[PDB]
Amino acid sequence: MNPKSLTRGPRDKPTPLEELLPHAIEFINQYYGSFKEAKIEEHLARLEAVTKEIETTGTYQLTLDELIFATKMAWRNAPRCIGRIQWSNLQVFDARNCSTAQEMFQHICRHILYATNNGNIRSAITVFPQRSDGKHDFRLWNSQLIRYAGYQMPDGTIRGDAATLEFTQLCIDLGWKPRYGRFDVLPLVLQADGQDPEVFEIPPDLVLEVTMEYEWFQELGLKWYALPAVANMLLEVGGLEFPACPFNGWYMGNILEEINVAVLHSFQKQNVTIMDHHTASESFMKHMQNEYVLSPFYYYQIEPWKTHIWQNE
Ligand code: HEM
Ligand SMILES: Cc1cc(N2CCC[C@@H]2C(=O)NCCc2ccc3c(c2)OCO3)nc(-n2ccnc2)n1
Ligand SMILES: O=S([O-])[O-]
DSSP: OOOOOSBOOOOSSOOOHHHHHHHHHHHHHHHHTTSSSSOHHHHHHHHHHHHHHHHHHSSOOOOHHHHHHHHHHHHHTOTTOGGGGGTTOOEEEEOTTOOSHHHHHHHHHHHHHHHHGGGSOOOEEEEOOOOSSSSSOOEEOOSBSSOBOEEEOTTSOEEEOTTOHHHHHHHHHHTOOOOOOSSOBOOEEEEOTTOOOEEEOOOGGGOOEEEOOOOGGGTTTOEEESOOEEOSOEEEETTEEESOOOEEOOBOOOOOOOOTHHHHHHHHHTTOOBOSHHHHHHHHHHHHHTOOOOSSEEEBOOOGGGTOOOSOO
């Protein structure tokens, strides 16, 4: 077999023009090929301008429409994603002129806001600036925008998310004051322009949680977040790399002390979208109505605290 790697790592120099140009040209062709006969003079015009822009600046910028096209195509090129069947239902937020972590934070708040929509979930992606030389990367160190903290008890026990134990400790190491619940929402750990990450609490009113509701099992205090958002992948398109491009959909669906009726009832009763038969038909219908090496592609990355060179720990 000759599978490709699903990971795209860091750089420390711009992509060499001899690599970038061919990829850029191929994407431009893919994009204008989305008409099948229309816009041959526009195609050639754009090919010439991109090639001149690359040769004069060392890189190039996508138009808004090309970016939107690229995020949707990357989505339908995601083999594992079940939601990609209705891939035209994606809202794009262009944050490519973002310069600071504070600004990153505000963009992310807007995303969570729009996407959550009081439970009537909407799919969205926010695209931050593309990699330049690889030393000014924008990154979210989170794996998800919303995820619970994980604590290892003085027993060797796991309290919270058993999968975030390492990231939670890194937040503490960065100044985040550890509460010790099993449902603590991790802060946003945001890197702008290649600099050390800054910690931002997520305003709690922005976090919609499904409180699970027999009758005594709500006494357990079982709870989960409504918005599944992937924070850590890199969007590749036409030779360009976007190391920060958080996106979301909605959900598909060990001290037990096993029916999923509690979750099924809690989500659906609290009007939080999930991928049931109603939503599947409704969303595919909206999708269909919108019709009036893989690339682009979402890559995995190397966890940034393993590769980051700290300016001033
Ligand atoms: C609209 C509702 C959506 C649903 C129901 C959905 C569902 C899924 C599911 C079930 C998986 C695999 C989960 C697992 O086993 O870990 C997945 C993976 C993924 N989804 Fe979605 N998704 C949605 C929206 C999105 C959006 C908006 C994007 C991107 C623009 C997207 C991109 C991906 C990617 C990149 C993966 C990872 C593929 C891999 O692991 O190789 N999804 N999604
Ligand atoms: C919070 C989250 C996690 C996630 N995962 C994919 C890589 C592994 C990670 C994960 O732990 N997945 C298991 C939980 C899960 C299952 C089904 C589903 C999910 C997450 O999002 C929508 O559909 N994917 C997504 N996702 C959102 C849209 N597409 C994928 N969100
Ligand atoms: O744009 S897709 O729906 O043809």
